[PDB]
């Protein structure tokens, strides 16, 4: 039934970090984003994707988002933007978390 409240857990915080490689494209169609990592194709996932979150017309403003991403995904992005006309190439640079230390 129905019952005063009771706060059974309240822990100290926990953290995310969540990063985003910025671009904008131009099509139109929309065009087909795809994404490659030091020359492989990068698969998109749970953890790191593409999202467009501004939309003009044939303006698409996104970032690919990395969340928690470590050392281990520094590296060259680049991008490829086809359309059924033609398609583009951008490649960056990307840096999410230095090298662990030595000693």
Same mark, same amino acid.
């Given at each position: 039934?129905?019952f005063?409240?009771?706060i059974?857990?309240?822990?100290?915080?926990?953290?995310?970090?969540?990063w985003?490689?910025?671009?904008?494209?131009?099509? $139109? #169609?929309?065009?087909?984003?795809?994404?490659? =990592?030091?020359?492989?194709?990068? +698969? *998109?996932?749970?953890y790191?994707?593409t999202?467009?979150?501004?939309?003009?017309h044939?303006?698409?403003?996104?970032?690919?988002?990395?969340? $928690? #991403?470590?050392?281990?995904?520094?590296?060259? =992005?680049?991008?490829?933007?086809? +359309? *059924?006309?033609?398609?583009?190439?951008?490649?960056?640079?990307a840096?999410?978390?230095?090298?662990?230390?030595?000693?």
């Amino acid at each position: 039934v129905h019952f005063a409240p009771t706060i059974t857990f309240l822990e100290s915080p926990t953290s995310d970090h969540h990063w985003c490689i910025p671009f904008t494209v131009k099509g $139109n #169609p929309k065009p087909a984003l795809q994404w490659f =990592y030091n020359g492989a194709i990068l +698969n *998109e996932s749970k953890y790191i994707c593409t999202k467009i979150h501004v939309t003009n017309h044939t303006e698409y403003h996104g970032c690919l988002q990395l969340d $928690n #991403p470590t050392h281990m995904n520094n590296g060259d =992005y680049t991008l490829i933007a086809k +359309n *059924e006309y033609g398609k583009d190439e951008k490649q960056i640079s990307a840096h999410f978390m230095g090298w662990p230390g030595i000693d």
